[PDB]
Ligand binder design. Sequence first.
Ligand SMILES: O=S(=O)(NCc1ccc(Cc2ccc(O)c(O)c2)cc1)c1cc(O)c(O)cc1-c1ccc(O)c(O)c1
Ligand SMILES: O=S(=O)(NCc1ccc(Cc2ccc(O)c(O)c2)cc1)c1cc(O)c(O)cc1-c1ccc(O)c(O)c1
Ligand SMILES: O=P(O)(O)OC[C@H]1O[C@](O)(COP(=O)(O)O)[C@@H](O)[C@@H]1O
Ligand SMILES: O=P(O)(O)OC[C@H]1O[C@](O)(COP(=O)(O)O)[C@@H](O)[C@@H]1O
Ligand SMILES: O=P(O)(O)OC[C@H]1O[C@](O)(COP(=O)(O)O)[C@@H](O)[C@@H]1O
Ligand SMILES: O=P(O)(O)OC[C@H]1O[C@](O)(COP(=O)(O)O)[C@@H](O)[C@@H]1O
Ligand SMILES: O=C([O-])C(=O)[O-]
Ligand SMILES: O=C([O-])C(=O)[O-]
Ligand SMILES: O=C([O-])C(=O)[O-]
Ligand SMILES: O=C([O-])C(=O)[O-]
Ligand SMILES: [K+]
Ligand SMILES: [K+]
Ligand SMILES: [K+]
Ligand SMILES: [K+]
Ligand SMILES: [Mg+2]
Ligand SMILES: [Mg+2]
Ligand SMILES: [Mg+2]
Ligand SMILES: [Mg+2]
Lengths: 422, 425, 436, 425
Amino acid sequence: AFFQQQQLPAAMADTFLEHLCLLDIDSEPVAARSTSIIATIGPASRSVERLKEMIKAGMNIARLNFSHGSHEYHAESIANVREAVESFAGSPLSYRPVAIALDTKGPGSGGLSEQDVRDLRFGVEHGVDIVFASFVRKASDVAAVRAALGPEGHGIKIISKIENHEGVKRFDEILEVSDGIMVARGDLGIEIPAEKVFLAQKMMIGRCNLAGKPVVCATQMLESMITKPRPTRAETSDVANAVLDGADCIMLSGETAKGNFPVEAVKMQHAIAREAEAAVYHRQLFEELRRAAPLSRDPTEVTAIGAVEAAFKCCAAAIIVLTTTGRSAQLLSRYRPRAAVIAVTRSAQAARQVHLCRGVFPLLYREPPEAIWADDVDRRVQFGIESGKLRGFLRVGDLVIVVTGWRPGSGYTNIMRVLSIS
Amino acid sequence: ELGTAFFQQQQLPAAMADTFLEHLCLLDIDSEPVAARSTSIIATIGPASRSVERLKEMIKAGMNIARLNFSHGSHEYHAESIANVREAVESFAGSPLSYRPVAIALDTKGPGPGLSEQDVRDLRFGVEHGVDIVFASFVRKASDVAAVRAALGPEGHGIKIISKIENHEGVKRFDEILEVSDGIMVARGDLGIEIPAEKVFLAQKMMIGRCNLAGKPVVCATQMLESMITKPRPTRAETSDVANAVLDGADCIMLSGETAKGNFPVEAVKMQHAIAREAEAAVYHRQLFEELRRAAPLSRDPTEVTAIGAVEAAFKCCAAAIIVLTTTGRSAQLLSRYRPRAAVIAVTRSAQAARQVHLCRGVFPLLYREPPEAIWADDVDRRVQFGIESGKLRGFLRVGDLVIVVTGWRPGSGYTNIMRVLSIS
Amino acid sequence: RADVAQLTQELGTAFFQQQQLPAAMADTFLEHLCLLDIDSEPVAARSTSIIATIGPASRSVERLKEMIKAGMNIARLNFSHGSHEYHAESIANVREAVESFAGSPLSYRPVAIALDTKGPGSGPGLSEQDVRDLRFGVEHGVDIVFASFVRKASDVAAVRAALGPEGHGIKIISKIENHEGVKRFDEILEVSDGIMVARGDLGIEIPAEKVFLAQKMMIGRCNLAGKPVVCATQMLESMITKPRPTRAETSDVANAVLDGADCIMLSGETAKGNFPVEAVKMQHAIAREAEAAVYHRQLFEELRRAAPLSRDPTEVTAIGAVEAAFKCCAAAIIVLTTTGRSAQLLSRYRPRAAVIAVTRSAQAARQVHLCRGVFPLLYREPPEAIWADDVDRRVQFGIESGKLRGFLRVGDLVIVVTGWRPGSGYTNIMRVLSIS
Amino acid sequence: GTAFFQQQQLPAAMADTFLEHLCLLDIDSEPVAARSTSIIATIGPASRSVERLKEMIKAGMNIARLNFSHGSHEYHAESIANVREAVESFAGSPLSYRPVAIALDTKGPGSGPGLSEQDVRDLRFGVEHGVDIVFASFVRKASDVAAVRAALGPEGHGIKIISKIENHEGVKRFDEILEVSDGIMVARGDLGIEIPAEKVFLAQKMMIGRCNLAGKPVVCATQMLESMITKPRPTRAETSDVANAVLDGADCIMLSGETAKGNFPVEAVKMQHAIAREAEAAVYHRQLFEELRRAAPLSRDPTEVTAIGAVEAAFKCCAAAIIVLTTTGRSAQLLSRYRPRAAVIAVTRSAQAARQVHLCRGVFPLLYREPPEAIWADDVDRRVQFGIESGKLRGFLRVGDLVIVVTGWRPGSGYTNIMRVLSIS
Ligand SMILES: O=S(=O)(NCc1ccc(Cc2ccc(O)c(O)c2)cc1)c1cc(O)c(O)cc1-c1ccc(O)c(O)c1
Ligand SMILES: O=S(=O)(NCc1ccc(Cc2ccc(O)c(O)c2)cc1)c1cc(O)c(O)cc1-c1ccc(O)c(O)c1
Ligand SMILES: O=P(O)(O)OC[C@H]1O[C@](O)(COP(=O)(O)O)[C@@H](O)[C@@H]1O
Ligand SMILES: O=P(O)(O)OC[C@H]1O[C@](O)(COP(=O)(O)O)[C@@H](O)[C@@H]1O
Ligand SMILES: O=P(O)(O)OC[C@H]1O[C@](O)(COP(=O)(O)O)[C@@H](O)[C@@H]1O
Ligand SMILES: O=P(O)(O)OC[C@H]1O[C@](O)(COP(=O)(O)O)[C@@H](O)[C@@H]1O
Ligand SMILES: O=C([O-])C(=O)[O-]
Ligand SMILES: O=C([O-])C(=O)[O-]
Ligand SMILES: O=C([O-])C(=O)[O-]
Ligand SMILES: O=C([O-])C(=O)[O-]
Ligand SMILES: [K+]
Ligand SMILES: [K+]
Ligand SMILES: [K+]
Ligand SMILES: [K+]
Ligand SMILES: [Mg+2]
Ligand SMILES: [Mg+2]
Ligand SMILES: [Mg+2]
Ligand SMILES: [Mg+2]
């Protein structure tokens, strides 16, 4: 029964053609949904009660579009998101962090606009986790956004939105200085011929997967759901293909900001992503990611590939990793393991931000500390296991891979352990 | 010899990549497509696309197959649609540069446990009006195909049966259905209501993969450019859906309400043409050809053996085209199954085969009507030269290009066994 | 180039030109062959063990010391010739020569003693002389038995029974020497600790032109099973009378290593020949060249794809450790082992990194020479009061011996493999350490 | 049949990995294909008798090597006469006649920097006596090859120059030497004294790999069966060395003292024949063909394009043979470079080309002696029929087998462009 579920007959195929031939509509997904969902907040999804339903439906990142609305309007949206998120904090083993992303208005006819400088300052003051920077055309645009965030915004992730020909052509220099990329298909589809957007999307997703940096697919993914309860055949196909392409995140704009079915749009992205993730041809994907990833003498990078290799060898249910900044979980995510990456962190901001990396399930650790560092490490690993059991990730008898470091503080991950559950 | 400009166009840097990941990383929006569009476009005929003048614009935009939906309209209405399509097609007979055959496909209303009374009458109408293809609705098992085949009377055994897979049973019994069908249509409208909407992409990719493995045509259908029924431009999901159906391996893509009742039928055809050309250049031929070669069983049929040798030869020299002589279309279909980058120019004396080969990706039919030569070798040479002269006129070929030529050792269908490399003079 | 650019800048272009690294990084086997370079010098310690047959030309303590220095790892006693008294003296001389280097524990080299049986002769199974010789082996503490003319699984059960309850730790390497042994190979390998491709008799029992097929098949199946395989007989035959081998002989040794042999053997070349030390030196020189020429990129991918999925933590840790070693060009993998099993599971994935096995068992230290790339370090210190401290001391002993022997340098990355509790069977940890 | 797929290591040939290919090798799986790696036997006192030479031809000798390091011109002229007498003694049966090449192996430069005066005289003797190949000793750079070519003069333009790599400089300048040579010999005797003995296998495998990539012949030479100079059976290392040279990709294997001065010249030829046949069946064609195809550059030469199409077609149908018509041997060489499992039966009127194609693995030359038919197409057909009849007599072909036939569009060398699938009747 285990080998008939989650497209495992198609996963064992010797060629990609045979993998496609073996895909089965009766093979049910079992793994937790890996691709994060970004939902845009607006009049249709601003109330605390509506936000609670969206969190239950699968929303991982809340997007605030600063192209519309005042600072007062967005501050109320942030407060409502935080109230809805904290309403589930009573159960620490099941609590779900939700990131807050600020999407800038952009340069307009201008580099960094004066309104963007004020909006970025607002983001820092309100503790946003991510900035989706509009119309990034070159590396200096990213440096300007970084400078506008100031010293208090050093920890905020900058996701550069590629929306025109110049951004596509200067992609490599933009990716090098950014934390990640958004394929902003709305403007991109007006700036370049509509029939070429898929080439830009597939190229950017491939390059981000090679670099090990998050990539978001955005705009008109479930467009018809703004007025209809069910999407078109092209829309379900688009969501599935963005996941198959390698997108870390998928996004909803008008579907959740102003549409009549915001919760149903989130539920639809969740259902499609789970089916598409099981249909990923890991046999070729892992080999190519492993071959293309450069040789490294960084112990976190070395431990990450050893852990992902070990996970595939034993069909590990999960890789439990301790992380301060999210980096150790990001380096595991870049190899696209089938095993869920359960990231245990004390940083509330890192827990929200790791939603940018596919297959990372953040667990915010709020248990009392242990006096002995080694006991504190062991307790965080046990917390990951207990949360895993509660959420359905793990069962007694499963094997897990545990990734830890030799001393406290970020940057010292160097250990991988094989553990039998209970 | 060819120049650096040649190797920068049609995604050739991405085509030479050693891995699929590197292939994706090398896709370039500035690398322009050069080859003729190989995935056929099926447009549904209705009130928005029925007039002769509107049909001429749709043919110019790229329509290759006209679909008649027998779920609506009388026999009289459909006979007039057929007459209008034929009048629009024949209006280009005076110019070899613009003349193109257009297939006529009859899409049945559907079943009841099996073949309905209305379907028997509509299939008889198809035979009497000389339709080329039948898109059989709600095919659930092999016996449904046998019933459609039987209903094609004594006169319509040459009509192609494309089985529409629209429910759970059709997906589960896919192998037995494909074995007896000429091809398949992934009918996503009903399929997306019969099975969970989030599983349709799995059924689509599986069926396209199995049809590619079997060497039989597969059509992707329904809601591909849906918003274009009322809007002049499609959504980002719609352009993505068209491109991904071509990348998946679909031989044909379809338009339903977009051309039958929408406000922008011609623009919807133009959009599918533009996307298909971009997607065809982005196909990763290096792995695709290797996997088609490895999965296809060994064969002692000379047509199959010649076809793989010809496709291999075409890749070796970047051949502009593979010119094949065919009476039934079968030799061109066996070349098409290996997905060559070179256009397959099929020279035939059969008007029906010329229309039907639009079902196979990359086949460009040329109907030949010269009186037969007394010396057979001279008749063959005249047809090969006709494919070369049509290719030069249409922009496929230039003097100095290499072409692969596929013929047989004697007249009559079934003897293809020769592949030749010719330098265009 | 992008996959090696940062490490080329850090380690230097000279590092990536040595040990056939351009050939090892090639994308195809054809390109791997085209990139093999006679100017690319081997740097790693020799990983394929050398078995030398003891006889009149290699029996003295002084001669044995030179053979140990030349590279002999396993001493073979051929019980087809000589009395029990003769073989007991050979064993005593080997042990005296080996223990002459024991003064320095950070550099000491263990040497295994293998007993090669006379065989069944015209009989159907275990002969009476073999029963007596196997009892002699147990009484004299031999490490390995090379069982002659093994034709079926019941032959190895008979050898095991003849070793008795005191010889349970002795490794049984079945010699395949005839058509029946080749045909029943799978059942024989299943119950054996390893195999010897005994080409002398095999080349008379089956057509001489088919021996290479049997050799390559048996080596491939042993590599797939993760069990040691020995290539034997006439490898450097002409060196029995000449100081230099023929072109076919050097080719044969190189190809046995490339095929995947864990051990290579010398028979008449060391037992009665005029150049025993030179024959060992020649096998050592060829094996280091051939080990560097192994196409690890495809070999590791195929060993990974063919090896079944496993829920054994030692197996899971071993593949993760070998993967980690390749990622950073690790100089070595240091493993703690009681029986040798954790080092054997690392060896089956054919890492380029040396497997430094720290053990308290003198017998396991001798026996691990059967597994390619395992360098045994015998730890003699009494246990620390705290088990975690005792484990740490053994890892540090491996690092310090590694630095002393030239295996490790300051700045190198090393992979360390340990377990969660004392006793054999609990290896489950892989650590990445930077050498200071 | 199941029996067909159990022979010639076909279970190991279908394996998905090289490791599984090795695990499936079976000593009971008998070779069926004709031995494709040519055997070069050195002529000396043990192999100069006309009667002894007839036995060596029957045992499998394809090329006779004359070592000009020993003996006068008078001695070599008598060796040539004896070889030709033994070869022509079988010319009364044209369907089974076996051509045998004559190669002149030069003394070398000695202490000099380039072409010696004795080599100039010996090369002129070779041209005057019609030798087919020159094995040029101690080639260290491209200018050494140009000097040999100049010494052969205008009458020796058709002689093949195989450069012997025997020292460090020759290995380091390998690429420039191969570029101007017809092929290479890995001369392991001197190479094993010029560089460390333990490094010779690296130089051998590298040179064979580079020659296979370039599509040029490579010979493995010296001490392959050394002990057979005095003993009736070789050592285990010697049989292994011969098998591994064939597995490495050598087009030819050589015997020196084993045939020139030993007591078992015929048995040494028989031993190389037996081992080569076993090793050829053990070649992992699945990865070999894929890598040769991928590494071979794109080409606009019709002979090159036809060759890859023909080899691909042969593998698709398990063709028993590829029958090719050739004037210079070039069309057969281009088929050989793709290492087909099918025998390449080369039909030629050039006695010199028939002898020289023995340098290319898997090429079986057939010398056609009939004068030309008045109708060129009939002359082509008669030569193809001669190939089929010779193939049936020699055991290459049987009724029911499929063959690939490679011909050209006009008479004369350089115009191969046609591949045809033929059923043997
Ligand atoms: O050669 S193919 O085009 N690709 C084969 C291929 C695919 C997935 C992976 C896994 C992976 C690796 C790296 C990645 O970065 C990544 O995102 C994913 C590896 C190789 C190909 C070969 C066929 O035989 C065939 O029938 C259809 C297609 C085909 C069609 C449509 C598609 O959209 C498509 O994916 C492929
Ligand atoms: O990584 S390997 O070396 N395989 C390389 C390989 C690949 C394809 C082909 C087909 C071919 C032939 C010649 C060609 O020139 C060419 O392009 C292609 C053959 C070998 C290898 C992997 C294993 O899993 C294993 O157990 C053993 C070995 C191994 C050992 C000794 C050898 O002498 C050896 O040949 C390989
Ligand atoms: O992923 P990051 O940010 O590098 O954090 C990993 C770090 O977490 C740990 O596992 C635990 O560290 P703390 O005890 O400080 O939380 C360290 O050993 C390791 O260096
Ligand atoms: O694709 P099909 O229907 O088998 O037709 C291919 C046939 O066409 C030819 O090339 C030409 O035949 P005709 O002259 O009869 O048209 C035959 O030699 C070959 O058998
Ligand atoms: O390779 P083996 O025989 O399984 O030994 C590995 C064992 O060695 C250890 O690393 C150390 O064990 P000891 O302290 O008993 O020597 C164990 O944790 C592990 O189980
Ligand atoms: O291999 P080569 O030397 O190029 O010879 C191939 C030539 O042989 C032929 O098949 C027959 O030519 P001839 O009739 O002159 O022998 C030509 O059509 C072709 O050009
Ligand atoms: O700005 C965006 O998100 C877009 O244009 O898609
Ligand atoms: O009938 C159709 O075309 C459908 O249901 O998609
Ligand atoms: O017994 C042996 O060692 C042999 O036959 O090779
Ligand atoms: O000259 C030769 O043949 C040699 O040195 O091997
Ligand atoms: K915005
Ligand atoms: K219908
Ligand atoms: K013995
Ligand atoms: K000479
Ligand atoms: Mg925008
Ligand atoms: Mg329908
Ligand atoms: Mg023996
Ligand atoms: Mg020499």
